[PDB]
Amino acid sequence: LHHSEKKYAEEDQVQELLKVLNEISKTTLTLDPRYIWRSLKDLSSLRNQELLNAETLCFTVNVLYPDSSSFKKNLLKFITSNHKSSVPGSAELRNSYPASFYSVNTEKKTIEVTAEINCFMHLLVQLFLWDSKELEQLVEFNRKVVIPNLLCYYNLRSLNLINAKLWFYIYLSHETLARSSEEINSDNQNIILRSTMMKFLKIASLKHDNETKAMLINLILRDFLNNGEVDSASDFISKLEYPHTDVSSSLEARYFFYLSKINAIQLDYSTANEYIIAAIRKAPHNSKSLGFLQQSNKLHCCIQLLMGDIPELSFFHQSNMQKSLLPYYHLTKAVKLGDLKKFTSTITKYKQLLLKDDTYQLCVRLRSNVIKTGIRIISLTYKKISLRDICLKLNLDSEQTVEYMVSRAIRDGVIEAKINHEDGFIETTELLNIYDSEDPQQVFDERIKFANQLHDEYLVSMRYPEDKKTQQNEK
Amino acid sequence: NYEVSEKAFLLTQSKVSIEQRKEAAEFVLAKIKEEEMAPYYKYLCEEYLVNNGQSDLEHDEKSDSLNEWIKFDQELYNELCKKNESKIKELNEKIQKLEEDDEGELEQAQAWINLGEYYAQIGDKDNAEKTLGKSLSKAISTGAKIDVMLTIARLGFFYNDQLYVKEKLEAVNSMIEKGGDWERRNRYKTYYGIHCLAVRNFKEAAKLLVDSLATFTSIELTSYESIATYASVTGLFTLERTDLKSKVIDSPELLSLISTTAALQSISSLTISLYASDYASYFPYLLETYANVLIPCKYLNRHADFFVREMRRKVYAQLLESYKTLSLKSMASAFGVSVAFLDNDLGKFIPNKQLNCVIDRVNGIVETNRPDNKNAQYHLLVKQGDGLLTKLQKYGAAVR
């Protein structure tokens, strides 16, 4: 029964391993193994549940084990395994073949098979851990082994993509351990993890690997959010080492998502407004990306309300995610109408929900934005309005209070008006008629730059796949 | 069936005129009982779910209607099924003999024509849609496929389907050659004009329901007085004052309806007050029309105040071009408008850039800004220009 179960799943794993083995042996092609590894994550997730854990036991028996002798026993010890007589030395798939990792040349140590085996061995370990959700000692045991192994290898062009996806599981397993249970050992454990990120990033800077650095930057910027250091994030993004060429679309959306939250504390939303919009256009619409589209839209509504301008109202109802976007609608309504008591009761009921996404602090600063937006609304209605006429609307305190809040709104060039105290009314200095100025000419220059930007990229993207069809023989 | 679904939704929300609640409650228990439709008496409970002023009395005693029981029971259900099961036995008996004979394409198509109307009158929706698939292969000429469009339109008016019904409406009307056929173009001025009310069009609907021929009588579906009522709805948006005095006021089609039924107060009272630009007589005709026209109709009350906001900004724009500077107290005593309610009316438009107006509260005067400027026209091209470049960049990177 259990004998035929191990031969079926292992043959499918070797069949996929032999495909990428001959691709890296001929010259240098870095895109051939990458296409299979994308589907390998989905195929292995469903395959690990079937036939239990016995598919990876004989895989260690097949290939020679440099480090893996005691790693499979410690993984099966936590589950209190039963002895099926799976002891190595029974199932042999090698049988002295060149593609089978011939044993005699391997045992004599005249050839090195460890490069394409041991590096691939760590990949299958992290896949089974994410399915069973194992924590505590099993997380630290794997992280301690991989770090010296990566420093011993030279990290060739094809070797940089093997561990590129392993860093995502290292950071994920460490964060889920701290949120589940907090202790004093978890704090000092992250200290070593912060040093390991910078040591490997410096090595990958020489190879200029596009996918490797794309995964690191996403994990490094996210670690600064929990650590709470802006100087580490500000100096990191100043180098601009992130390639835009071969990185995946899912990795691009995560990059622009961090720049929106970093620039949000600098009180400059001009650049941050583009990063949050570009992150949505680069994020897939599938179900696996719904978690990112949910968090990205929550930040988009908060950026516009902090700019003094009301965002698009139809964005809530047209989308199907508005169930979680309902609290943000009451925030926009309270700022636009200008009611002081409505804003206090708005954030009170949802105060518990605003703590998870850490957007409650941005909601506290909306208290002043209620008046900032209310002044712009009443200014467009009345070009010349008296001093006591505004207090009768928003129910402000005194007449001197409303007079000094308008002078602050013109600091950034929002209202663009003047206050005449001798006459007793506030007059708007904006006559429009900007068609006679040079201001629209500056915006029109960027539209030509944006049009010709995609023209050069059009020749690069379309012509590249036609290179292989010329050399290949056709009928 | 008659009117499809109207009287069923008359009891949904009624602000005034409680006497209409009794008439609407007696009509829903009359036609449905007289017709052969079994299930449409059961849907009365599902239509009023989560609504104010429900006419269904089960767990909620707040019903204000005189007839509070719309609820489905087994007394009327058993009586309607006996008539439905008896006729389907006779229809399936005669048609089955024609299927085995297979003489001509007329008897094969006409057999499903009587069924397409029958399954709609016995309360079968999805079962009637399968009857069109068999009649499609048995179609003879282009006119045979037109009857399929009627079945899609008739069955689509119950739930107000704007997707499959609206798309298949223009497909049958086009096909290979459109032409001036009365079985297509005339139905294009009616069925398509109904779907424009649910999507809030008011532009293309004004080019059909307003300017058209003098009859368009669909009998069971719509009547002449019903279609003529919506002529003043979409006609006050796209059509300017030049077309209001021709295709609305002086149009002979609406002249006979004013002298017949004067209770509409839409094509007459609203058009004369708007043409004269007199706010004194324009105000009292807004509440009278909103109550007796917009609220009872199903394709109107869904808009209601949304359509009222468009009528008010129309008269404010006409008077804006009639003067430059005017005192607020002078206009208040002229057209009979209050000062307190004047600030709230102009506060829902000016900040939205709907109308450009300047008001000086020191002297209590209103000014007139520039209605059209060169920079104001280019600002609309910014969103339209960037809106196109967004699709070209987003969809261009998706396919690569």
């Binding site: 698009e312 109202l313 809530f316 109802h317 047209q318 609608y329 | 949304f306 906001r309």
Partner: peptide, 27 residues
Amino acid sequence: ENWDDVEVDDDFTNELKAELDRYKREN
């Protein structure tokens, strides 16, 4: 649905009939 169906209206209901009060009294 730009600036219309999202915020609805929620006005001009009981305040419209109240306008005729000041019209039939002060005049």
